[PDB]
């Protein structure tokens, strides 16, 4: 430890500079200086180590200088105090800081190593050998604290590719701990995992990062979840597929909630009926971590009467309350109708050359009739949630849409196909048998507005639904088979409907003011319904194929 050995170490290194022209002697003096320095490594002052490293650099002794720094580092902290003080988080700042002085010198050597060899080719040159020996010392070192400080240095430089090709396990430990605190380092870890074909772990990083309290925008959190769902939908080696689908499910649920929050935040900020003093606080609370469905509903979607987003929340939350779901559909239908009606009015004023109210901006292109806009809102939710949902109870929802169409005159008086409710549900994929089942119930229970002469339209709906049904049976060539199927009950319904029609004709002929004008319409509809009943009876009286529908 004492002074003579140190002086003789410096003496050898001095003589080495004087013998640069004699390569065997230069190499021997340098090794001897290194040997003596390592003997007194625990006692070397920062200034002595610095001068020695500088002279070693001048003589191209890169690897030996680094080995000396690493030897000094361990000897001043043989208990590995800095490692434990780091794996935790104080007077052990003595052990870590003394080590870091050695580590900073190593950075110095490596910087000069690259500068002296920049623009030279990799038998290997002596420069290639010195590079190999120097980085063998660095990378084969067991000082994992040194490696942590080294990785931090590479990152501060932007030398990203050098981090990724590290074949050591210490770099995993380093990135995993700084991913919990900084968004940047978490990305390297995922880039580290995936290139090594480890997608599930990268999905776990991205997921916990999407759930973290770091500063991440909602839209960036959606990107992380979209990524994780993908990395967690394909199994990397050696993890139970029954745990893959676990992470894939979690990322999927969060992604669903996150998109509802994103659509909710986008609408609130753009809403003219929301005051600005509220919008800043809205963006502050929604553009960040993902909220609970309960909070998104009670504090935002419900208050704002965003009935479509409420229905998406009910779907995501497995909310079991058919009454609330149906009432929310009713509010969405009526809200959408009222909005579409006002845009039509303003458009019609422009077409007629009228005057708009002050400040009103009319649609520049023809806006949809109210039932078209209503249908669009229904279809948007259907394509987003699928019909396999509790927010699509056809038995309850189809009568609500049908009642809307009658009560609001969305019929041929505005140019609409009177059967648009039925075409809507059929085009969404609702099976024909279920639609006719609902329409059978509507015809038999006679609840307003499905009363009086308006039951003519209900028969029109039945005829249309059955027409499209037999056409689809003829197209497929087979009838798939208490899920309702085509049977005698359909034929009985069509027969029954004939009595409804003659009853409606009779009350029409005697209306106060003159006979109704739909006498021939009803007569033709009677013939149409009877023709459909023949087709149904022929399909049932036949033997044609009943066919397959696998799960
Ligand atoms: Na508004």
Curated annotation (Swiss-Prot):
- Subcellular locations according to the entry: Nucleus, Nuclear pore complex; Nucleus membrane
Q: Which GO terms describe its molecular function?
A: structural constituent of nuclear pore
According to its UniProt record, where is this protein mainly located? nucleus
Does the record's keyword annotation contain Magnesium? no
Choose one Gene Ontology CC annotation of this protein and give it. Answer: nuclear pore inner ring
Question: What keyword terms does UniProt attach to this protein?
Answer: Membrane, mRNA transport, Nuclear pore complex, Nucleus, Protein transport, Translocation, Transport
Can you supply a Gene Ontology BP term from the record?
protein import into nucleus
Source species, domain of life: Eukaryota
Statement: the UniProt record of this protein carries the keyword Iron-sulfur:
no
Q: Which residues form a coiled coil?
A: none
Report the protein's function. Functions as a component of the nuclear pore complex (NPC). NPC components, collectively referred to as nucleoporins (NUPs), can play the role of both NPC structural components and of docking or interaction partners for transiently associated nuclear transport factors. NUP170 probably plays an important role in NPC assembly and organization.
The record's similarity note reads: Belongs to the non-repetitive/WGA-negative nucleoporin family.
Subunit-structure text: Component of the nuclear pore complex (NPC). NPC constitutes the exclusive means of nucleocytoplasmic transport. NPCs allow the passive diffusion of ions and small molecules and the active, nuclear transport receptor-mediated bidirectional transport of macromolecules such as proteins, RNAs, ribonucleoparticles (RNPs), and ribosomal subunits across the nuclear envelope. Due to its 8-fold rotational symmetry, all subunits are present with 8 copies or multiples thereof. Part of a tetrameric NUP192-NUP170-NIC96-NUP53 or NUP188-NUP170-NIC96-NUP53 module.
Record-given protein name: Nucleoporin NUP170
Provide the species name.
Chaetomium thermophilum (strain DSM 1495 / CBS 144.50 / IMI 039719) (Thermochaetoides thermophila)
Full-sequence portion shown in this chain: 851 to 1416 of 1416
